[PDB]
Symmetry: C3
Subunit: 179 residues, 3 copies
C-alpha cells in the first residue's frame, strides 16, 4: 500500500491516480459524497480510457471493501483520510457540543478504525493507494476542535506512513518519494 | 523557467537570488510596492560592491510586457511574488463589490488567463526567468470565506507554474530542495 | 549540531531520538513543563529497557549554561522545542505590556542574541547536539497580530539554526528527509 500526502490543492489525487494507470478494473473509495460524485461524474464521460472504474462512498469498516477477495491486478484508490477523521469526530462526538468532548477517547476509536484499515490492507492482494493531507505546517488554531483535529490528524498520518510501502509527498503537483 | 516555492520566512527570496547568480543584467519584477521599495533600497547598496546591473519594476499584470522575446539569454528576471500577484488580481477582478458577492469561479479563470500569459511569455523568453511563490495549504482550513478561496486558487495556480517550470525548488528553513 | 523540523505531531521527536541512537548519557532539554513532564514519564517507562541513561531539565534561556565545553563526544543533547522557546521569550520580553504595544523589532534582536548563544554554544560543546523546531509558515497569513509576527520571527530563526546546523532533517508524517 502506498500513502500520498500533501497540502490543499497540491495535486495529490492526480498523482495518486497517476500511481494507478492501466489496471482496467479499479475501486474508488470516497470519504465524502462530494467526492463519490466527482468520480462517478468523470466515469460517465471517461469510454476514453479502457478502465472499468468503480466507486463506493465510505469511511468506516474499510475491511469490507479492502478485501482479500480482490485480484492483484486490481487497484484501490482511497480518498481522503482526513475527511474520514472529521466524519468520525462528529459521530463519535455524538449529539454533543465539541466543547464537551472526550478527545482522548475519540482518538482511540479512530485509531481502531485506522488499525482495521491498516489491517485489511495487509490482507488485500490488490494495489491500494491512500490520499491524505498535511495540515500541521501552519499556525496553532484558535478554535478548540481545530486544535485537536490537527494533532489527531497528524498522529494518524504517522501510523499510515509507517504501514506504507511507499510514501509520496506532493507539492505543487510535484510528487516526491519519501519512502 | 524556474520555480521557487516555500513558506513565509523560508528564505526562498534569498535562494532565488542565488539561483540567478552572476548575471549581468537583472530585472526584478515586484508584484507589489513594498517588494519594489524593498529591493529599490537593496540595490542602492550592493550597487557599488558588485558589477552586475540590477533594476526594478512593479508589475503584476500583463507580464508579457516585461517578459519579452527581445531579451538576451544572459539576461535574467526575478519575479516576486506570485501569491501577492494573485491576491492583487482578486481585488481588482472583484472591483468595488463586497467579497461575499464575488463569483470565484469566474475570477479564477481570469486569473488563469493571466497566468497563461506569463507561462507563455516565459516560454518565448530567452532570458533566465525565476519565479518566486508561496506554499499556503499545509495548515488548517480557514473560516474566513475569502481565505478559503485564495488558498485553493493559489494551490491550483502553483500546480500550473510547476508543470511549466523546467526546474522546481522547495526552500525549507533557507535550505533548497530540487524537486524537479 | 543537527536540526530537526516538520509540522505539529509529525513524529519529529521520535526521529530525534532515533538520531542519538545509543549515546550512553543523554540530556533532554525541555523548553516547557509539559515537554519535560512527558520526557520524564517516558524515561521512567524505558529506563530499564534502555541502557543509555536519560536525564531531563527545563530551559529556554542561556542555554550555554547547559550546553558546555565539558561534555563527551559520546554525550548527547536533545533540546526540544525551539519555537516554544521563541514564544516564551516574546512574552518575557514584552511582559507587562499588551502585545499591541509591543516593539517587535526590538524584541527580535534580543531573541537572536539568544539564538547566537545557543549556536555559539553548540560549537563549543563537544557533544552531539540535536535541535527540534517546527515549521509554522506553510499556512495562510494570520489575522492575529502577534501570530503574524511570531510566524515571521520563527521562520527567520529556523533559518539561523539551519545555516549553522551540519545536518538538517525534515519530518513528514513520521518519515525523515535529510535536506542538508
Amino acid at each position: 500500500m502506498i500513502l500520498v500526502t500533501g497540502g490543499a490543492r497540491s495535486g495529490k489525487s492526480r498523482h495518486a491516480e497517476a500511481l494507478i494507470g492501466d489496471a482496467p478494473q479499479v475501486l474508488y473509495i470516497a470519504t465524502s459524497q462530494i467526492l463519490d460524485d466527482e468520480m462517478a461524474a468523470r466515469i460517465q464521460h471517461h469510454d476514453g480510457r479502457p478502465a472499468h472504474w468503480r466507486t463506493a462512498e465510505c469511511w468506516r469498516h474499510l475491511d469490507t471493501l479492502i478485501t482479500a477477495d480482490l485480484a492483484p491486478d486490481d487497484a484501490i484508490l482511497l480518498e481522503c483520510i482526513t475527511t474520514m477523521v472529521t466524519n468520525l469526530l462528529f459521530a463519535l462526538g455524538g449529539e454533543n457540543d465539541p466543547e464537551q468532548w472526550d478527545y482522548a477517547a475519540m482518538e482511540r476509536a479512530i485509531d481502531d478504525e485506522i488499525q482495521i484499515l491498516i489491517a485489511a490492507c495487509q490482507r488485500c492482494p490488490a494495489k491500494v493507494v491512500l490520499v491524505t493531507n498535511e495540515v500541521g505546517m501552519g499556525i496553532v488554531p484558535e478554535n478548540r476542535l481545530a486544535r485537536h483535529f490537527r494533532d489527531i490528524a497528524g498522529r494518524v498520518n504517522q501510523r499510515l506512513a509507517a504501514a506504507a510501502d511507499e510514501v509520496w509527498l506532493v507539492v505543487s503537483g510535484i510528487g516526491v518519494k519519501i519512502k
